[PDB]
Amino acid sequence: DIVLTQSPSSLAVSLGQRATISCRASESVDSYGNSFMHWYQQKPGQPPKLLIYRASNLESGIPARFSGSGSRTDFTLTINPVEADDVATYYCQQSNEDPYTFGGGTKLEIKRADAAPTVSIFPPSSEQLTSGGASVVCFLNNFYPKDINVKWKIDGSERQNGVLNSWTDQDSKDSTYSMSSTLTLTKDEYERHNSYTCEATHKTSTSPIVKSFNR
Amino acid sequence: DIVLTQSPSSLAVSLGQRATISCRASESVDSYGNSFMHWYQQKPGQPPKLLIYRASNLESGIPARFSGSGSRTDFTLTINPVEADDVATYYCQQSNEDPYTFGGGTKLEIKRADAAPTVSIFPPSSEQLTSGGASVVCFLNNFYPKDINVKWKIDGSERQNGVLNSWTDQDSKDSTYSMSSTLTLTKDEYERHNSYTCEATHKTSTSPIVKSFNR
Amino acid sequence: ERDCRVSSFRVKENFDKARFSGTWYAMAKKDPEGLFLQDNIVAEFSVDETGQMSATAKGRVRLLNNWDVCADMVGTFTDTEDPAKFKMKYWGVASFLQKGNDDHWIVDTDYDTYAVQYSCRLLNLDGTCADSYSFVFSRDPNGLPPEAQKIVRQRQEELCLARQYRLIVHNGYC
Amino acid sequence: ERDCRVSSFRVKENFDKARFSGTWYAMAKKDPEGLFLQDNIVAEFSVDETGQMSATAKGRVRLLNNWDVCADMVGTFTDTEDPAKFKMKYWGVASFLQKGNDDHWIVDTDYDTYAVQYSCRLLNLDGTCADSYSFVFSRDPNGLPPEAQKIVRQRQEELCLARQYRLIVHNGYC
Amino acid sequence: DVQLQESGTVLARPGASVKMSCKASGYSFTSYWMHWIKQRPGQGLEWIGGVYPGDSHTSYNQKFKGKAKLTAVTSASTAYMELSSLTNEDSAVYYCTRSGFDYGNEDWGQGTTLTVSSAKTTPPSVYPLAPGSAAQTNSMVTLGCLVKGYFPEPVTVTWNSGSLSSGVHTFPAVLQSDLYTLSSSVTVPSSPRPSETVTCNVAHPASSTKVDKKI
Amino acid sequence: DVQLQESGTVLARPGASVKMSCKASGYSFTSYWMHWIKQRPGQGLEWIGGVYPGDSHTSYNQKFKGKAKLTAVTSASTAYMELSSLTNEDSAVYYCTRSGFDYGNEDWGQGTTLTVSSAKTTPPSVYPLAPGSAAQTNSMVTLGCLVKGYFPEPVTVTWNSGSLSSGVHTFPAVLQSDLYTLSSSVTVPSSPRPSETVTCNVAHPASSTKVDKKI
Amino acid sequence: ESKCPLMVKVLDAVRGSPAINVAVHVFRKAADDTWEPFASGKTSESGELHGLTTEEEFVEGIYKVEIDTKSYWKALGISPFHEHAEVVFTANDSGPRRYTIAALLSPYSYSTTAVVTNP
Amino acid sequence: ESKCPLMVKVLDAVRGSPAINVAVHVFRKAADDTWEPFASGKTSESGELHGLTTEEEFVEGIYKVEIDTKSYWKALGISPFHEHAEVVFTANDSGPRRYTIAALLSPYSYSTTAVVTNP
Amino acid sequence: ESKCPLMVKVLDAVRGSPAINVAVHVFRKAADDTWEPFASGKTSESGELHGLTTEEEFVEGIYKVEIDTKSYWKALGISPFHEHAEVVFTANDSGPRRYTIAALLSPYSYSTTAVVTNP
Amino acid sequence: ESKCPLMVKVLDAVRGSPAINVAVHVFRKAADDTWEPFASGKTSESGELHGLTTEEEFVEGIYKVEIDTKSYWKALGISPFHEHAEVVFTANDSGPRRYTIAALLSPYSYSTTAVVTNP
Ligand SMILES: CC1=C(/C=C/C(C)=C/C=C/C(C)=C/CO)C(C)(C)CCC1
Ligand SMILES: CC1=C(/C=C/C(C)=C/C=C/C(C)=C/CO)C(C)(C)CCC1
């Protein structure tokens, strides 16, 4: 087959500037006088979206922002002015030679200005204890940059076990980031303590944001 | 009567620029709502030429170059773009009060680029001797600036007596200057020597231009 | 000895559109502000059965510049509370030709040989005329008897306009 | 295995202006350089008594930009030393509509259901076609039997144009 | 317009087999292809093959030749792909997309998720997330929703039957043991709740379970 | 067109008397005035007075009241000015110019020169100015002409009856003793002379003397 | 039926044809500086517009002819710039006359022009 | 300061020179239905009128530019046709555009033209 | 006598009238890139010009219409700027058509314009 | 260096924007009778063509400026009428004047305009 390689895998740039996603090929993708290269926009929790057909011809529905170029084995998807709602992964693909093949894609992220995370913590409801297991939930919403740190403090004691992580791709409107956490204990190991805390460690601040409640 | 005074008496400016000939008055020349001032162009060997009637109204025949202005006791003739053939004397005159009166006029000259004088000397013809008097003529034509200097050398000796001068107003096409000279001796005092010379002293050159001939 | 009040100006009493009607040639004038009939001026007055008086006047004008248009004008005189005084609505046969409405006082005349008109375009603070223009019509373009000139002389001084007249030329341009 | 010489291109023998005449719907094309009938294309062929063949073709074009003009075209085919080969003089009924004269090769057809044309605007150093455009007309805008597609497939590869066809849409814009 | 629907989630045992559908609607089912793309998590996009309904013809990628058997009923207007002797790898989301009878890339289907485990389908468990206070006046309030231990994925989640959409955060999967756990959160003015009925609608097709929990 | 001619030069004895003419031709002799202006050398312009042929009326400047008596024959269409009991001052050029029956400045007459001496009219003396050589080939040559001791002024001087005009220099007056002396010079290609007849035509009305000298 | 002191003609600048179906409206300045409906109409095949008024109805006064340019262009398909073109002049001021206004409207510029004569 | 949003330029077709000291009048179609005054001025020697309104007061809405083509011509002793020339348009509807109204004028004709830019 | 595929009209911009007595000359590009005399004539009272050629003589080809503008203006009295106005187009290229050229000459600028249709 | 004697400016009447990269051709009527090439160029983004000839080689004589209005329009898929627009005039006859040929163009119309200055 032919090899497609996505230059940088992660891609960040400020809202309003240009993008320059690449895609080189093991073989040539051009034939009889053209170029069979294609670009797709695959956003979170959804399937691919066609953008450019034949490394240059735009798709009816896609805005001027995009535009492609290349030949032989060098092509490039151009996004400019990068727009808030364009945060996604961009895969190229060729159809000049069987078998069809795609690129490793590229995650495009946006550069913005920091925002401390809106924290929130909640007490395992009734029926969750009514199972033989404990799980307190804390929400880390709309924050930035990506990297954040959560630590569950249960009676001054840092809990490592029960730690369930989950992050969400950069939003689409305010281009932020969010995480959820939840302390998954036994229902018993819940009634063996009385001070439940969710500490948030983030660069947006020196002092860690602390949300808690007690049994 | 009323007094008319021509600001500068001599007036020089380069071909293509403007002139600003003046004419102030002892009394006011304006009456019932107008101004009775007038401008004339008097070229060499000719009579005055009407230019502007009523310090503002142009005469049919005169070009846009000219134009007047003023009131009360201050008026001004405007020549622009001064033109080669406009070398002359400009007199103003008023007719608001009797008796009529003119101005002292003003000689307008043109600024140009130097040119050494084309010299020429000639031997008193036959009949001039046939009178009882000698006169050798030398012509200093088309030169510039105005000031020049002619010295008659007759046998290395500088002749001062017989010196008859004559200059011509700046030409009209090439805006130059010319002078004639002639050594007026006796017919005898002509046949008492044998080397006749006309030396021309002018800024256009260090070495004086010398034209001569011998008896 | 003061003077120069348009109203003070004395015009001809008992004017007669009739006796006046006919051909008239401009010998001299006084240029008001703005553009104005320059050379070769000639007017033709002529009243009708209803008594209304109108006129036509061929004259040259250097409209714009290098643009010498012999203009064929026309104007209707509305009568005023004075046989002599008038207000002249006008225009040119041709359309682009300055259209207008100015006053018109047949200053004086003797009907058969000379005629002097004054027109005060615009009034002065006190009562002098700022924009003002005039004519000295003659029944004979061939000129005018001194007597007439002599008389004309008077009027002008009376119109506070002595000297201020630029004499008209008749080369037959048109 | 080499190929791509316009003359090498193999067209339909014994064309028949007659049998081909009628309505035809554009299913697919190949965009030459420059502006070109964009969406909603439909042609109407029809020869006359003298044998000459002409046509009309309503199609949309994004002339200029934001300027979407359904264009009503017309073109007269001059016959060539080949019943299949042709030279198309044309123009739009409306005047500003691109006028022109290009070649026209009825590449292939079966007369009743499908039609494939090729037109080589301009030749290549050796003999390939640089500026080149084509169509795949169907008698039924409702589509085309695979067999036909299948056949069309051939032709295109033969015209050295496989894949290069942008499929046409029929929303009824006009 | 070009509608392209797929079949519900698939759950299969290691070594078994499966078949998927993909009804066409809006274009000539015989005038297009229809390929199947495979997309695994930290992986990307792999083409599988495609069918030409009209010729019932087929094109596979040797990497799948012995894994996916594709078919298609013209009349039914649907293409199929059969996954034989499954492993834990073939488990991924498969997309169905139509393709030109000349090019490649155009329309993609919602995509049917595919899990190849041995655990038994366990329906969700929805718990509502309520704060520790009526949540004071006028202060904006964030409600939550907890989806505990379910399997396999996915599990559509929305609020107010989809009315509320702005200010919502639906956190991704997490393998709680051999079960999963998802969380959602909605943020709203102190005005909507509790005045209005705040409802979190969790759906899990895999188990035919629908549940709407108030707040 | 407006022609305005004057009478020939005047020569008068100290204390005598003189009268001048000024025929009008081209305009109504009765509809204009006609003034007499006096212009002395390093002096300028002085209005004298004017006549209204029609009214035979007259306007003088008190400075001349007792010096110039003006008259005018309508029929003859000529105005006159009589200079009584002459001195050496009244000697100057007098110009005649017509004037409007309302304003003041328009047409000037050639102007009649006026000399008031006691010396007796002495006819000119023309001598030709020739170089000291045929004047080589192709080099341009300058010919001259000498007007010796004549009186009073002026003395029109031209070449080839006026053909040759360009490249001519006619030098002004000079009181050789109690006689005058004028010179002229013409510049010509080596081509015109001696092939063609170079002639210098000197004329002195004052003495009814005409002379054309070849070269 | 008779003559027409006023006529309004318009040509389509892009097309190089007559601007057809163009709506027109002329008015007259009343005794209040207002604009009273004098007459309306729309261009024929010719591109012209005849019969608006009469050598009589059409009297002295300042009038206003408003060429509905927008509805021309927009209707065909371009996003014209001028909301509409207008014409205001002093009608039959120095007597009776034949007025003809001509427009050569374009999507982003127009050149109104008129020619007048006698009967 | 910075840059001027809307500007006009007027040319004297007759003499092939700019028409100078020509009055201009810009109004804005108001909430009610009449053109409340928005700005005025005179044509510079350059034949233009820079600095009409600033880059923001020139809000979004309909505008009318009135060029006193009348007095101008009249000034040169010529009786013109149009009582004035106006350009009515909709501006700043979508983002900010650089409006430049130009005019070529003659005694019995005239034409306007607009150019829009962005940065 | 018959129709006329070609008509040439001209209006006097300054005057706001028809440009009368204007000389015109149209040509056709021969087989050498030269300009062969196709037909001449002069504007009538109308300002128009009819009968230059026929639906037949007038054939396909590039033609050139030269409006003698200078001799118009100069004759009247102004020192016009353009030596003369010209018009060149590809005649009856896409079949048969009726061509009408219109000029609105002014002393320092002109605006040629044509409108074409069928019979 | 110094300043540019003759210059051209071309506007796209249709879009209210300058027409860019539009060819221009200036020739000089020669001693014989044909226009020997004098200069050529392309329209800048400013829609003009500065630096045609210098302030002296641009001698005294007849000149013809040829604006390729053709290919331009054609470029935007529109078939125009005129094969090109030219301006033929006499320059530097009396002293030195500053020539500026301007052009407003449409698919079926156009007009040229000239402005002359001095210093
Ligand atoms: C009507 C009329 C007269 C005035 C004519 C004028 C004032 C004409 C001006 C024409 C201009 C200024 C043309 C430039 O466009 C006079 C009293 C002579 C005679 C009586 C009839
Ligand atoms: C005449 C004609 C055809 C070609 C039409 C073309 C090529 C039109 C281009 C129009 C443009 C570019 C309009 C923009 O002004 C085809 C072969 C399709 C059908 C047979 C008749």
H86 among annotated binding-site residues: no
Q: With contact defined as beta carbons under 8 Å apart, do A190 and A155 qualify?
A: no
Residues of C in contact with I17 (CB under 8 A): 95
| J19 CA: distance to closest CA in chain D (Å) | 13
The tokens describing B12, both together, are 């020089």
Rounded Cα distance between F171 and B181, Å, is 10
Neighbours of chain H (3+ CB pairs under 8 A): C, G, I, J
Helix (H) or strand (E) holding H18: strand H17-18
| Single-letter code of the amino acid located at D143 | G
Beta-bridged to residue D71, according to DSSP, are: D59
Same domain, A102 and A150: no
**Interface residue G17 vs chain D (CB under 8 A):** yes
The tokens describing H115, both together, are 């150019």
Helix residue spans in C6-140 (DSSP H): 17-20
Give the list of residues 6+ apart from residue I34 with CB closer than 8 angstroms, or none: none
**Interface residue J15 vs chain G (CB under 8 A):** yes
Q: With contact defined as beta carbons under 8 Å apart, do H10 and H18 qualify?
A: yes
Pocket test for ligand 1, best of C68, C70, C73, C74 (most atoms within 8 A of CB): C73
Rounded Cα distance between C109 and C27, Å, is 14
Q: Which of F29, F101, F103 to mutate to test the interface with C (most CBs of C within 10 A)?
A: F101
Domain positions in chain G: 1-119
3-state SS string over chain D?
CCCCCCCCCCCCCCCCHHHHCEEEEEEEEECCCCCCCCCCCEEEEEECCCCCEEEEEEEEECCCCCCCEEEEEEEEEEEECEEEEEEEEEEECCCCECCEEEEEEEEEECCCCEEEEEEECCECCCCCECCEEEEEEECCCCCCCHHHHHHHHHHHHHCCCCCCCEECCCCCCC
For G117, the closest chain I residue by CA position comes to I17
Q: Which atom of ligand 2 is nearest to the CA of D63?
A: 14
Rounded Cα distance between H39 and H41, Å, is 7
CATH topology of domain J1-119: Immunoglobulin-like (2.60.40)
Q: How many CA atoms lie within 13 A of C100 on its CB side?
A: 15
Rounded Cα distance between J39 and A175, Å, is 56
Q: Is the CB of C53 under 6 A from ligand 1?
A: no
**Interface residue D168 vs chain E (CB under 8 A):** no
Chains J and H touch (3+ CB pairs under 8 A): yes
Q: With contact defined as beta carbons under 8 Å apart, do F113 and F9 qualify?
A: yes
Residues of G in contact with H104 (CB under 8 A): 111
State the pairing for strand pair C166-167/D22-30: unpaired
**In the 8-state DSSP scheme, what is residue B115?**
B
Beta-bridged to residue C86, according to DSSP, are: C79, C104
Strand order of the β-sheet with F168-171 is F126-129, F141-150, F180-188, F168-171
Positive or negative, the CA dihedral H101, H103, H108, H109 is negative
Residue with tokens 């898929």: J77
3-state SS string over chain J?
CCCCCEEEEEEECCCCEECCCCEEEEEEECCCCCEEEEEEEECCCCCEECCCCCCCCCCCEEEEEEECHHHHHHHCCECCCECCEEEEEEECCCCCCCEEEEEEEECCEEEEEEECCCC
Residues of I in contact with J74 (CB under 8 A): none
CA of D56 relative to ligand 2 center, distance in Å = 9
Q: Is the CB of C116 under 6 A from ligand 1?
A: no
Rounded Cα distance between C41 and B74, Å, is 35
**Main-chain phi, psi angles of A176, to 5 degrees:** -110, -145
Domains recognised in chain E with CATH numbers:
1-118 (2.60.40.10), 119-215 (2.60.40.10)
Give the list of residues 6+ apart from residue C150 with CB closer than 8 angstroms, or none: F55
Contact criterion met (CB < 8 Å) for C146 and F55? yes
Numbered residues of the known binding site of G for L-thyroxine: 9, 48, 111
State the pairing for strand pair H99-106/H85-91: unpaired
Contacts 24+ apart (CB under 8 A), G19-23: G19/G43, G19/G47, G19/G72, G19/G103, G19/G105, G20/G44, G20/G45, G20/G47, G21/G72, G21/G75, G22/G47, G22/G49, G22/G67, G22/G68, G22/G69, G22/G71, G22/G72, G23/G68, G23/G71
Ligand with an atom nearest the CA of residue C100: 1
Q: Report how this structure was experimentally obtained.
A: X-ray
**Interface residue D153 vs chain E (CB under 8 A):** yes
Rounded Cα distance between C47 and C64, Å, is 34
Q: Residue A84 in 3-state DSSP? A: helix
Rounded to the nearest 5 degrees, what angle is found at the Cα of A69, between the Cα atoms of A63 and A74?
A: 140
For J76, the closest chain D residue by CA position comes to D64
Query: Where does D1-174 sit in CATH, by number?
Result: 2.40.128.20
Measured from the Cβ of residue I85, the count of other Cβ atoms closer than 10 Å reads 26
Q: Residue A7 in 3-state DSSP? A: coil
Q: Residue F67 in 3-state DSSP? A: coil
Q: How many residues does chain J have?
A: 119
**In the 8-state DSSP scheme, what is residue E151?**
B
Kindly write down the DSSP assignment for every residue of E44-58, as one continuous string.
Answer: --EEEEEEETTTTEE
Neighbours of chain F (3+ CB pairs under 8 A): B, C
Strand order of the β-sheet with B149-154 is B157-159, B149-154, B195-201, B209-214
Q: With contact defined as beta carbons under 8 Å apart, do A64 and A80 qualify?
A: no
Rounded Cα distance between I103 and F109, Å, is 53
Rounded Cα distance between B68 and B62, Å, is 12
Q: With contact defined as beta carbons under 8 Å apart, do E164 and E197 qualify?
A: no
Rounded Cα distance between J90 and G24, Å, is 43
Residue with tokens 């000895």: C1
The tokens describing D122, both together, are 């301009």
**Main-chain phi, psi angles of D19, to 5 degrees:** -50, -30
Give the list of residues 6+ apart from residue H100 with CB closer than 8 angstroms, or none: H6, H7, H8, H9, H114, H115, H116, H117
Contact criterion met (CB < 8 Å) for H82 and G87? yes
Rounded to the nearest 5 degrees, what angle is found at the Cα of C106, between the Cα atoms of C22 and C154?
A: 115
Same domain, A108 and A145: no
Q: Which CATH number fits the domain that encloses residue A98?
A: 2.60.40.10
Beta-bridged to residue A110, according to DSSP, are: A13
Q: Which of E2, E30, E51, E101 to mutate to test the interface with D (most CBs of D within 10 A)?
A: E101
Rounded Cα distance between C52 and F9, Å, is 63
Q: Residue A211 in 3-state DSSP? A: strand
Domains held by chain B: number = 2
Domain positions in chain C: 1-174
**Main-chain phi, psi angles of F37, to 5 degrees:** -105, 145
Same domain, B32 and B126: no
Contact criterion met (CB < 8 Å) for E102 and D162? yes
The tokens describing A4, both together, are 């497609």
Rounded Cα distance between J49 and J43, Å, is 5
Contact criterion met (CB < 8 Å) for F185 and B101? no
Q: Where are the beta strands (DSSP E) in C110-161?
A: 114-120, 132-138
Closest CA to I100 of G67, D95, G6: D95
| G56 CA: distance to closest CA in chain D (Å) | 41
Prior bond of A48 cis (ω within 30°): no
Closest CA to A179 of A129, A120, A125: A120
Rounded Cα distance between A207 and A205, Å, is 6
Positive or negative, the CA dihedral E165, E167, E172, E178 is negative
Contact criterion met (CB < 8 Å) for A32 and D166? no
| Single-letter code of the amino acid located at C34 | G
Q: With contact defined as beta carbons under 8 Å apart, do F126 and F200 qualify?
A: yes
Give the range of the structural domain holding residue B190, as residue numbers without chain letter: 113-215
Measured from the Cβ of residue C116, the count of other Cβ atoms closer than 10 Å reads 25
